[PDB]
Amino acid sequence: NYCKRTPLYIDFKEIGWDSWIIAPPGYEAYECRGVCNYPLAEHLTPTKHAIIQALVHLKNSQKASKACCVPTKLEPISILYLDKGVVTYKFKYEGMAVSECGCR
Amino acid sequence: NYCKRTPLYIDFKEIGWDSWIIAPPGYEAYECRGVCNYPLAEHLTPTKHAIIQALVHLKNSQKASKACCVPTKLEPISILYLDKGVVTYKFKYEGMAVSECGCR
Amino acid sequence: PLVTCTCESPHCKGPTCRGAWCTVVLVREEGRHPQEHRGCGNLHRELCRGRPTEFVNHYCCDSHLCNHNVSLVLEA
Amino acid sequence: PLVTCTCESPHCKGPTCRGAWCTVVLVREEGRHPQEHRGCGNLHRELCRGRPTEFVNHYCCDSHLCNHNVSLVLEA
Ligand code: NI
Ligand code: NI
Ligand code: NI
Ligand code: NI
Ligand code: NI
Ligand code: NI
Ligand code: NI
Ligand code: NI
Ligand code: NI
Ligand code: NI
């Protein structure tokens, strides 16, 4: 399938982060999976290098790999975390949730 | 091998861009290839979502794919291109050469 | 100004789309049959100027439904 | 302030490295044997606080060469 944003729920307990993440128990971090086949669609904001690299991959796969589907804009979440045993509230935990995917 | 910047020379003639790219005949665009195995090294400036997604991929590969090696900072090149038959000089053709890779 | 274009690509949320120009992109990977994509274009107009190769051909136009039922050919 | 740390990872340009804290990361993929990485850490200190799991264990310290010859264990 093509490069798009896929739902991905992270359970902090199952990655060992619940030791310091009091709340929430988890969150929808989403995930950018899918192939970046040429032509690279504009809604995936592909850079000129990604477009060029996708063109060389078509010429022969050995010289250049295909452009990859990766998150392009990340959104913060609000967490309750232990600060030396003290439950503190962090409003914006940056770089946690995916809002926009793309081909780079 | 691990995520790193690989030399990649683009010949504009062999991708059909020499019809409008008068000069140069090509350039070192570089390429970010390699696996983003955990732990994600700091010199690849991995975001928190990339680190989390790499942790779920270790738990089971079916739920979340591995973080991908992609360019993070692109550099412009100078080209001579046809503007309605006129050879014009563009100083910064943005997003052409890779200067920094990373895991996203 | 924009233009309405025929949309026949995996990224088409409908039969038509609105962009600065209409696109027909004939792509061929190393193994499988060439696929013909139809849609609009707003960024990287320079893709339209690329000479057709053995693996890619970019056609572009800015008339109403000008990219409809247009057949492209690749290089040998 | 930084600290000198034992470097035994694929990203080590030398036997030692200088960072805010020293790291030992024991990672296990689904198929192959667990690998033990040693190095420094400057970002994402919260990785050090993660409870050891069946697949990852993060050890961190900020003494001189404190991450040298330190053996980690994963969860069953
Ligand atoms: Ni999307
Ligand atoms: Ni999980
Ligand atoms: Ni392709
Ligand atoms: Ni660009
Ligand atoms: Ni690098
Ligand atoms: Ni080439
Ligand atoms: Ni891994
Ligand atoms: Ni981040
Ligand atoms: Ni142009
Ligand atoms: Ni912390």
Numbering used by the authors:
A (entry chain B), B (entry chain B): 321 to 424
C (entry chain A), D (entry chain A): 30 to 105
Article excerpt on this structure:
Bone morphogenetic proteins (BMPs) are dimeric transforming growth factor β (TGFβ) family cytokines, initiating cellular signalling by forming a complex with two copies of type I receptors and two copies of type II receptors, both of which are type I transmembrane proteins with an intracellular serine/threonine kinase domain. Activin receptor-like kinase 1 (ALK1) is a type I receptor specifically expressed on endothelial cells, mediating the signals from BMP9 and BMP10 exclusively. ALK1-mediated endothelial BMP9 and BMP10 signalling plays many important roles in angiogenesis and the maintenance of vascular quiescence. All TGFβ family ligands are synthesised as preproproteins, processed by furin-like proprotein convertase upon secretion. It has been shown for several family members, including TGFβ, BMP9 and BMP10, that the prodomain remains tightly bound to the growth factor (GF) domain in circulation.
As expected, the ALK1 ECD binds BMP10 in a 2:2 stoichiometry, and the two ALK1 ECD monomers are not in direct contact. Using the PDBePISA server, a total of 26 BMP10 residues were identified at the ALK1 binding interface (lines over the sequence). Secondly, by solving the crystal structure of the BMP10:ALK1 complex and comparing it to published structures, we have identified three regions that are highly conserved between BMP9 and BMP10. The conserved region 1 accounts for ALK1 specificity. This additional residue leads to a kink in this β-strand of BMP9 and BMP10, resulting in a novel conformation that allows BMP9 and BMP10 to form unique interactions.
